[PDB]
């Protein structure tokens, strides 16, 4: 298993830890110390989950669910079958992700490329952790965190959401949202532009970046450019996930009432608070 151009790149070096010990491949996969780190953390995790599945007495993926220790146990540990398993698995998953990232930093180094991929990943890792570590620890219990199950974690979302009314009203969530919808729009567009250039009307020549720049300038009066759009996707993406963490770190900590109500700060401003008419008085 090698891509036809692959061999020249498979040189020794790059590794962050272990010298050359785990400096090798298995099929397409690069290993690394953090390949081993990953496999360990990953296997032990799936092993505890497969077990928590029998202490719960079920072998269906749509039903398996590993809940955090209930609000009682605080920020302390818990006997396995009613808590601890979650905690250990959560440790395992953080192990597994951080390892994966560090492994990518190793692949980066061997390839002479920059760190932009595992840097981006670190934003997803931080989002996870926000929900399972930073939010709970600030709030006082592993119980506020989400359970590990397909449909059960959606329950937690709906239940956490509705605890503060219609969650839409969270302003940081409002921002994060905008970024998810923009990033998708940019994705749709970017993909289409490049393909519309490489795959022109039957019989015609491949178009150029100038045709890309022109098409947009025609369409909207602007064009961000083949460097820009790649800077842009990355910004919309990470920005979405940034405000995602923000919107949830501030919910149940600095603000814990109905989100809709926060918006009265604007309405109850001196110079218009008591003017007659409109929707508010």
């Amino acid at each position: 298993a090698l891509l036809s151009f692959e061999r020249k790149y498979r040189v020794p070096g790059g590794t962050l830890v272990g010298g050359n010990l785990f400096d090798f491949w298995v099929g397409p996969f690069y290993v690394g110390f953090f390949g081993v780190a990953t496999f360990f953390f990953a296997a032990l995790g799936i092993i505890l989950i497969a077990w928590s599945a029998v202490l719960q007495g079920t072998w269906n993926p749509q039903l398996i669910s590993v809940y955090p220790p209930a609000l009682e146990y605080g920020l302390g540990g818990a006997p396995l079958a009613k808590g601890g398993l979650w905690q250990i698995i959560t440790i395992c998953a953080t192990g597994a992700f951080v390892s994966w990232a560090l492994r990518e930093v190793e692949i980066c180094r061997k390839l002479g490329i920059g760190y932009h991929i595992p840097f981006a990943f670190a934003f997803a890792i931080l989002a996870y952790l926000t929900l399972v570590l930073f939010r709970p620890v600030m709030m006082g219990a592993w119980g506020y965190a989400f359970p590990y199950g397909i449909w059960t974690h959606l329950d937690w979302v709906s239940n956490t959401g509705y605890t503060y009314g219609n969650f839409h009203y969270n302003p940081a969530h409002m921002i994060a949202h905008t970024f998810f919808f923009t990033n998708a729009l940019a994705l749709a567009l970017h993909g289409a532009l490049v393909l519309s250039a490489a795959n022109p009307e039957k019989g015609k020549e491949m178009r150029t970046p100038d045709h890309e720049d022109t098409f947009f300038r025609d369409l909207v009066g602007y064009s961000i450019g083949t460097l820009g759009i790649h800077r842009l996707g990355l910004l919309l993406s990470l920005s979405a996930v940034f405000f995602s963490a923000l919107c949830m770190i501030i919910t149940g900590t600095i603000w814990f009432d109905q989100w809709v109500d926060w918006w009265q700060w604007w309405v109850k401003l001196p110079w218009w608070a008591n003017i007659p008419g409109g929707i508010n008085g």
């Binding site: 932009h116 970017h190 100038d210 309405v267 409109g278």
Partner: protein, 302 residues
Amino acid sequence: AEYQNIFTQVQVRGPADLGMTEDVNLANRSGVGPFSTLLGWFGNAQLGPIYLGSLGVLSLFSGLMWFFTIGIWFWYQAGWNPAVFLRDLFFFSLEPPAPEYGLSFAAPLKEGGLWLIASFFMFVAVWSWWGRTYLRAQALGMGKHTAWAFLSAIWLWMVLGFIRPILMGSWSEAVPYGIFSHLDWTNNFSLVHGNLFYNPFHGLSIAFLYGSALLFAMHGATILAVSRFGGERELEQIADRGTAAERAALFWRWTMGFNATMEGIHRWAIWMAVLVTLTGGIGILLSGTVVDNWYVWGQNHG
């Protein structure tokens, strides 16, 4: 402080670029706009030119005719009072006909006759603007991707405001024009239908939306990382594959066991994103028309 390529270090400007000709009627292209040094740090510095045919001018007009229709009803709701207007801006709303006016155009102005006006103006602006995306690609001899992909977004929008209201028998089902109020309509929709977390199309719509954020993040970062070999020059790497294209494919191969080509990745992108509103629009269309409660449906047809 190794450089990263998120911001430009030295901008460079030459003669304003009037862009490729092919079959474009140049009489309709305008003159170059100014030059944003600001924008320049991230992407292109050159504002304009912009094409503006008859179709384009129709679109731009009726788009504003929509926008204003909403705005004048927002002023009426404020009692024509500047301070009230600004205080309550998110709170105003232009709602559609009550359920009793059915699908008719009879409804009094002040009770959603006005909504139907702005909506008509909207329908015109979007569909005209759609053909605009096709025609600009035709003029330059390029593929129809942009227009195909835009239609997928139009699908959801068509379903929310037009197709689903037609199928359900009334205009009342359709989204109101208003910031806080359309947000409420969203939450309401979910409640009335058993919770959309039980709509398998809503789940997919989500998978892809998250996926769009995953992919564009992966991709965007990949290019920047291989931009030290002119990675961003994607079209030419398709035509004559470079080390940039190779070390890219290989980062991913070595990490996750498979990979993309410099053309292919963009097919991944366009489909990922398009499938958000594709599945989305199906999910919405089925709601109310065929399935009244998604929890219930979920229990039977598992």
